[PDB]
Amino acid sequence: HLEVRDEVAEKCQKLFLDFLEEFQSSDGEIKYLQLAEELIRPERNTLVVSFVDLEQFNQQLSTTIQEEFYRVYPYLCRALKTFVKDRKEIPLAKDFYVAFQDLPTRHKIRELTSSRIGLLTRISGQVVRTHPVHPELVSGTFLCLDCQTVIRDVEQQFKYTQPNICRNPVCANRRRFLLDTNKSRFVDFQKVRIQETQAELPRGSIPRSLEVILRAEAVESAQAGDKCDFTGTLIVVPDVSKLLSYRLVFLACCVAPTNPRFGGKEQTAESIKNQMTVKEWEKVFEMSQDKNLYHNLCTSLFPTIHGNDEVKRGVLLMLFGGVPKTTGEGTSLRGDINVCIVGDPSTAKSQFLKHVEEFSPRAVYTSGKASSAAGLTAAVVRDEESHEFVIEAGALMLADNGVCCIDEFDKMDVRDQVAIHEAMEQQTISITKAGVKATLNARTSILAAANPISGHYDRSKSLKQNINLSAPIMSRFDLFFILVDECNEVTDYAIARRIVDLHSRIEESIDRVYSLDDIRRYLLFARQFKPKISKESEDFIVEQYKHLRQRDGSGVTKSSWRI
Amino acid sequence: AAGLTASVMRDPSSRNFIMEGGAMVLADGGVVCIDEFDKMREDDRVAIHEAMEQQTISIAKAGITTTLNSRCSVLAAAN
Amino acid sequence: SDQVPVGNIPRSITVLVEGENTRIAQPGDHVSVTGIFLPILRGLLSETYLEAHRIVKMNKSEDDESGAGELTREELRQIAEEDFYEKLAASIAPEIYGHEDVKKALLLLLVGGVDQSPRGMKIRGNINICLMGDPGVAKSQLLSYIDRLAPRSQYTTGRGSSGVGLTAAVLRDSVSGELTLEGGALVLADQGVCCIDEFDKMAEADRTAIHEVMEQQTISIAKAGILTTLNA
Amino acid sequence: NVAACKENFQRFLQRFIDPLAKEEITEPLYMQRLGEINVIGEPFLNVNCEHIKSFDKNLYRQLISYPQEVIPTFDMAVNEIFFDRYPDSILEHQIQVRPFNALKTKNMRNLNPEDIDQLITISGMVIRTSQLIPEMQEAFFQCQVCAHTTRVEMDRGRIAEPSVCGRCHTTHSMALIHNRSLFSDKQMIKLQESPEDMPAGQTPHTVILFAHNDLVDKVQPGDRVNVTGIYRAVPIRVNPRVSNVKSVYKTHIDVIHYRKTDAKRLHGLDEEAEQKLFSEKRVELLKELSRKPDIYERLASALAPSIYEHEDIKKGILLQLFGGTRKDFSHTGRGKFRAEINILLCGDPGTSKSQLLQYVYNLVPRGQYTSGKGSSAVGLTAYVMKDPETRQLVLQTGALVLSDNGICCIDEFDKMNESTRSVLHEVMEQQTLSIAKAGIICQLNARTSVLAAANPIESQWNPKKTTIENIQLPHTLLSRFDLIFLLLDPQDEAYDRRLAHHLVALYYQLDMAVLKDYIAYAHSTIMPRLSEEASQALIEAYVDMRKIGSSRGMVSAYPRQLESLIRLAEAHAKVRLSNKVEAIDVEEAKRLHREALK
DNA sequence: TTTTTTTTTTT
Ligand SMILES: Nc1ncnc2c1ncn2[C@@H]1O[C@H](COP(=O)(O)OP(=O)(O)OP(O)(O)=S)[C@@H](O)[C@H]1O
Ligand SMILES: Nc1ncnc2c1ncn2[C@@H]1O[C@H](COP(=O)(O)OP(=O)(O)OP(O)(O)=S)[C@@H](O)[C@H]1O
Ligand SMILES: Nc1ncnc2c1ncn2[C@@H]1O[C@H](COP(=O)(O)OP(=O)(O)OP(O)(O)=S)[C@@H](O)[C@H]1O
Ligand SMILES: [Mg+2]
Ligand SMILES: [Mg+2]
Ligand SMILES: [Mg+2]
Ligand SMILES: [Zn+2]
Ligand SMILES: [Zn+2]
């Protein structure tokens, strides 16, 4: 009559409760008794147990978790409600959640077969959408109706599930119960959609996608445009309209960035100067003290491009960024600089853009002929499920605070170069559509490459006649690098030598100092200062603005895109 | 606005062409005043020429073959 | 659309072919059907369908006599004569005086050469013919005649037909949002003859859509719903 | 019916001999197959259900007529003849059996209802696939009172609830626990009949196939397969509520076996593991043929043995079938590097251009053929379609991405308005494609190689104008090509006489498997690396090209050409298996680049 | 009865 001991679950609950107390760090001082300390102040309810340490302390256990992770999850959470009663200030009906991390072996969204349901996996991908956060009923307390009793602790499974039996021999309604909602147990619930990462795409294929379901204090870790790394279990989900048809869903428990630039834990100079490991900080200092730095970042960022020494400099100064200011009235000065390149055929334009977009993190790459207006900036999509018009983020938004690389900028249509100017001016994106009214921020820096009208750049006209951009756009860039293929012969030896060298010594002949991983660190560090202007420098600046206008002065010469 | 004579415009709802009788079809026996006789749309000026010629407007286009009697008086001012 | 009041909309009917009459009729085809006329099961108004008992193709304006199409020895008499080739030539559109030689070529167009395939290199076995000439020489009469003397034929005018309406067009269904293919003139006239008069007045971007059908005799579509090659 | 068939099948599997040749008598044919299955993984046995037509005729009636009540017997009767290697290697899953047919059996238009539920073979061109769909096999129930968990099996094709707890007997308390049950996979694919084998003046059909547990991801859109599987028909319900089913059923195909290996085309890149499956008798042949002083001109001249001389164009189209090395530039941050060759053919009419495209397209596997006006901007690369069921925008692949390993023949290159022509700029130089539309922001990639054909402007090569004026293409597009072959029509009477004498011959009436295997080999085990003597002839070969192409006004030379020479030079070395680029491999692929524009 | 994307006829 009485229930059955799910032995494989309770034995695991017991051993996990033991592990939580016995395991200690390098200096005694049991570690899951101090991380579990902050677990009492409100809004914290997830303990993050590393999985490699559960491998040290035990191994007959890891093979039970990693193979029954759905059977034994409802117990690895009760065995955390007992271990934390030693604080006495937790509300007695509060519930906690275990969140693993640092699994050994990874997987791919295409290896998620149906032989993986109920196990413990680990997945990496991008993030496309993020729905809003909701409550979700985990265990309802049905207030009985005729008995005025309380049927209690009834578990829902993807539906309302209406338990229909009462422990009272006189329960006039085995089909009617009004549940309360001030004692029942709710948990947050966000549902996002992830898309196969770039480095896994089999050639000639469109990327797949799946639904992940964040269900805890982890509920707004992943945002759109990020490259998080989820670790949970694959589950099946029915179609509740007819409760069949099943569909796969990932049920994540922990989520963390895929490659931390600072491996400590994940916003000013000190917060970051804390995570700097000893070698990291003794190297960043060495660079910051280096002289001729401004020539060893160019030579180390673009190692396979002979010449154009005046373009690499501009690209660097674009990567570092200026100081973004907000006027007291409520307006805002643009902080980051935009850069456009214009040149003859085959002059290494798309190579600067490919370099920048593969080096930088959170920088997007798009062509111009294969884009749209509502695809760059922001869209509006009818979710018939919610039957509402919601906002979709565009390339100018999921590259925020990064760099948007637009190739072939002058192939875009007439109406698609308008939406981009409306964003490049005010740094924002307005939306006024079916039932949506919003204003979104966009603090991207644009790196664009274009082609002169009729192939070659004609050096007897102004710019406005050599390119077919609009008039307003050409004003919002303020750095142009016209490249020309001067029909010379001393270069045509140098470029030849460099290309054949690169192709003969494929991975060598590249002798850059300051390896690429290191420059990311230096650039994440040095991008948190706000330099000021001394009075002498202000005088110098106004004098230079004086000496620039008059060069365009009448009589002697002439120039293009007047100052 | 719509014009002086009739037009054939692609209706958003119907996605097809519909007929817009302008002013000279609404003025029944009345009088129509015009200024700047070189500003009016080329097509519109052609059609007003024919309307003062015949005293009716008959458009034969995409899905429209109708006639509208124009009975009004033109008081034009040139430049 | 001929036997409709001057500007009225044609009405349709539904035919439930089943059993053995299936696969007889092709879409876009003249046909004659014989069957009961019943209402549909499941207030008092009713929707009706025709329940076909017999389907006969009437393309030739009379019937399909492919079974009785065998010739007689009394006709082999003619076909064996010395100048059988020259009788037919004179018996093509006899209402038209002269043009003794043009009618000799419009017959070769109806008979057609042979088509090879050596080492996998197709060679077409059809013949194409143009009739450049002054006004009023009865060209649109010759073409109207060669239209009726062909089992599968089509008639098209250069100034009243667009380049996607000759080859094949991709069109959407506002009921399903799904793009489907729809054959043009050259597809519906697969094993037959197509006739295009007013050929110098066809728009220049709507005329290069024939260079494909005149040599390789396929139509290769790669629009945004479909990617295929129809046989024309 | 069950015991009577395994006994008759084991015999076949043991005593069978064929008058044939495999992998370039070893009597135990299927026993040798079953031995190979044991020496490696892959527990599938590809049996040809025509061999079983020679050895027998009363199982070949019962395999294509009751296939679902037979194929389990054909598995069991193979598990036991696995006795030889039972103790040696013990794999886990099971052994399998997969009947098929070398040649098709039906079309997609002649599937009649006397063929429901019986083995059937068709052929087509896969259009699109779907994501996996679970499918329950073993239920797992659990009571709310006794909390006792029984596990009922699905036997007939439906799941029945017990309704009595073996302990507490509450007469209905057994809920179904979903995520504790067992599922299997299922994918939905769509075929499309080939242009050949369809009636006069009609449009292609489609047929829905359902894959299953292990065949679940073995095919890609853009492939030409010979699917073999049962043919089933299941009812549908007018309401998703009532049990009033319709009377017109709905059919699909439970696939059992794929086959992508067609005889006439080269080896697709699924057979790189199969290159190690070459007879060592054959590698001798290849290595020895690769030593004759002219194996280049001897293989080239064996392409399309119906075109007349045109000696250089066949050289170019032969080097295109090998391509430069696949170097790995991930370290230098440069990105990736194109290794395939794009070829353009321009020349006045009648010069047999479209025949060369029609020949290549029928040679290479994974290819396409497009035209001028019947192809749009998005139909070539990637479009966005309102998916019908889920009412959501989903991405699809065009033609330049379906090829992806092979050649994308684009005839009528001139007659494409400049919009849809400026799309090739990305996919043909970087081997990528960056899409940013309504909800889709992604970046595909492909390894295609264009082979285009155009006509001069005015369609007549008038020698009054300059070479950069008969073509009338921009420079930012002419430089992405690296072999611009200008065919012309000179009026030499000797040439006309020889050509006519050749063409008439086509009206009366080297091997392939040498070329078809030489190519697979030269792809699998070759990687030419440059030298220092070759690299020193590549620098001057670019410093002269500039002075030459500058004045004449024919076609300028930009540094991109200096990479093409590499692409060509290496591609020449692969022809002779030289594994190292030397001097002559630059002079040849320089004379080729120079003597094509004249 | 709304967006967004893609093809073809029309002013
Ligand atoms: N100055 C240079 N130094 C080194 N390599 C160069 C240089 N200029 C061009 N190249 C090489 O030549 C090619 C240039 O092609 P891209 O830069 O991709 O084209 P692009 O400059 O964008 O011109 P278009 O307008 O797009 S054809 C690449 O393979 C470069 O490696
Ligand atoms: N030799 C002829 N024999 C018989 N009828 C003729 C002859 N020449 C002219 N006709 C008649 O003259 C008229 C010619 O009209 P069409 O046949 O339309 O001319 P056409 O050759 O189409 O001229 P275009 O190209 O359209 S201006 C028809 O009524 C013919 O019957
Ligand atoms: N050298 C040749 N060898 C073999 N056949 C040839 C040769 N030259 C011409 N032909 C034949 O002549 C015809 C030429 O047709 P195509 O190959 O289509 O020419 P094309 O280049 O496509 O013409 P345009 O420019 O596109 S109209 C075919 O029937 C070929 O068989
Ligand atoms: Mg470029
Ligand atoms: Mg006429
Ligand atoms: Mg051609
Ligand atoms: Zn009760
Ligand atoms: Zn029970």
Residue numbers in the entry:
A (entry chain 6): 15 to 257, 292 to 314, 320 to 616
B (entry chain 5): 411 to 489
C (entry chain 7): 241 to 282, 291 to 480
D (entry chain 4): 158 to 181, 188 to 672, 682 to 770
Task: Give the article text.
Unwinding of parental DNA in eukaryotic cells is performed by the 11-subunit Cdc45–MCM–GINS assembly or CMG. The six MCM proteins, MCM2–7, belong to the AAA+ family of ATPases and form a hetero-hexameric ring that translocates on single-strand DNA. In the absence of DNA substrate, MCM2–7 adopts predominantly an open spiral conformation; the co-factors Cdc45 and GINS—a hetero-tetramer of Psf1–3 and Sld5—bind to the MCM5-2 interface and lock MCM2–7 into the closed-ring conformation required for robust DNA unwinding. The 11-subunit assembly of the human CMG shows the familiar architecture first demonstrated for the yeast and Drosophila CMG: a two-tiered ring of MCM2–7 proteins, with the Cdc45 and GINS coactivators bound together to the N-tier portion of MCM2, MCM5 and MCM3, so that Cdc45 faces the MCM2-5 interface of ATPase domains.
Here, we report the cryoEM structure at 3.3 Å of human CMG bound to a fork DNA substrate in the presence of ATPγS. A continuous chain of eleven thymidine nucleotides is bound in a right-handed B-form spiral within the C-tier channel of ATPase domains. The single-stranded (ss) DNA contacts all six MCM subunits, from MCM2 with its 5′-end to MCM5 with the 3′-end, and thus traverses all MCM interfaces except MCM2-5. Four MCM subunits, MCM6, 4, 7 and 3 make an identical set of contacts with DNA, involving both PS1 and H2I loops. Within each four-nucleotide footprint, an invariant serine at the start of loop H2I (MCM6 S425, MCM4 S539, MCM7 S410, MCM3 S419) is hydrogen bonded to the 5′-terminal phosphate, whilst an invariant lysine in loop PS1 (MCM6 K486, MCM4 K600, MCM7 K471, MCM3 K480) is ion paired to the subsequent phosphate. MCM6 F442—the aromatic residue in the [+]x6[Ω/Ψ] motif—unstacks the second and third nucleotide from the 5′-end of the DNA by inserting its side chain between the thymine bases. Three of the six MCM interfaces in the ring: MCM6-4, MCM4-7 and MCM7-3, are bound to ATPγS, whereas the MCM3-5 and MCM2-6 interfaces contain ADP as product of ATPγS hydrolysis, while the MCM2–5 interface is empty. In accordance with the apo status of MCM5, the MCM2-5 gate remains ajar and the MCM2–7 C-tier ring adopts a shallow right-handed spiral conformation. Several indicators point to MCM2 acting as a ‘seam subunit’ that has only partially engaged with the rest of the C-tier ring: the smaller interface area with MCM6 (1391 Å2, instead of ∼2000 Å2 for the other nucleotide-occupied MCM interfaces), the disordered conformation of its DNA-binding element H2I αN, and the higher B value attained during real-space refinement. The likely explanation for this observation is that the slowly-hydrolysable ATPγS nucleotide has permitted the engagement of the CMG helicase with the leading-strand portion of the fork DNA substrate but prevented its translocation to the ss-dsDNA nexus.
